[PDB]
């Protein structure tokens, strides 16, 4: 029901039906961010696609032009503008966190305790390719929502 | 026994919670598209030059040409202005 995390009662966490249940562990291990052995560039493209597509909604429908005819275009530009600024945050996060030679700071073990290769997302180039996918994905996802809503 | 000097990674619980090393489940030709079209944005040093300058120029263009139909601040005052309190 409520067990110590991985049987260790002195790690600072619990294993509950929310943290680790068969359906929870499946959906979380299927998100592009937990695909530890797949290309980080293609992760970010799916991430940017999903987010830029989501950002078009609130900007257009709540912006200062929400009740005008210039609504869909402005909130979409505001949506892409939010993707541009977020891509700078993702970039400077990598420039500060990861160096050009450091290995992945990702866990090299599994839930059962065997040695695998760490998620290269947590490296300088692996981050540089992830944020590059987010930017390309976020711009096209903004456009895709802008395509379906006002075209 | 959750303590081991030869495996300090398990003693401290350095486990990947939901990381799945399953291979890429994507359209592999779409991958060749995403890997070659989103490629120039994958240098963080150049991307920072791009986002900083591209956004700065784009923000400048949109604000420089913003019509009065959009910005009250560029449309300007329309009413005649009222005097000051002491015939100012």
């Amino acid at each position: 029901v409520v067990q110590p995390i991985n049987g260790d009662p002195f790690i600072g966490s619990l294993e509950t039906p929310v943290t680790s249940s068969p359906l929870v562990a499946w959906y979380l291990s299927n998100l592009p961010g937990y695909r530890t052995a797949v290309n980080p560039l293609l992760r970010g493209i799916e991430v940017g696609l999903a987010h830029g597509f989501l950002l078009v909604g609130p900007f257009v429908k709540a912006g200062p032009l929400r009740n005008t005819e210039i609504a869909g275009q402005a909130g979409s530009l505001a949506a892409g503008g939010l993707v541009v600024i977020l891509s700078i945050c993702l970039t400077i996060y990598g420039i500060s966190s990861f160096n050009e030679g450091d290995p992945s700071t990702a866990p090299s073990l599994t839930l059962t305790g065997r040695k695998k290769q760490p998620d290269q997302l947590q490296t300088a180039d692996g981050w540089a390719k992830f944020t590059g996918g987010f930017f390309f994905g976020g711009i096209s996802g903004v456009i895709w929502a802008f395509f379906l809503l006002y075209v | 026994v959750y303590f081991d000097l030869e495996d300090l990674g398990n003693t401290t619980g350095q486990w990947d919670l939901y990381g799945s090393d399953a291979p890429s489940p994507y359209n592999s030709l779409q991958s060749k598209f995403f890997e070659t079209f989103a490629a120039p944005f994958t240098k963080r040093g150049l991307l920072l030059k791009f986002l900083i300058l591209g956004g700065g120029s784009t923000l400048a263009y949109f604000s420089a040409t913003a019509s009065g139909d959009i910005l009250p601040i560029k449309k300007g005052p329309q009413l005649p202005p009222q005097l000051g309190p002491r015939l100012g």
């Binding site: 400077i92 500060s96 | 920072l48 400048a60």
Partner: peptide, 30 residues
Amino acid sequence: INLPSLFVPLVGLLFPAVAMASLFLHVEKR
């Protein structure tokens, strides 16, 4: 208006973003 529409977004959006990004990298460097 032809110049305020240029400098107000530059000093209030671009410069602070460029400054905040610059200082974030200097303070985090080792």
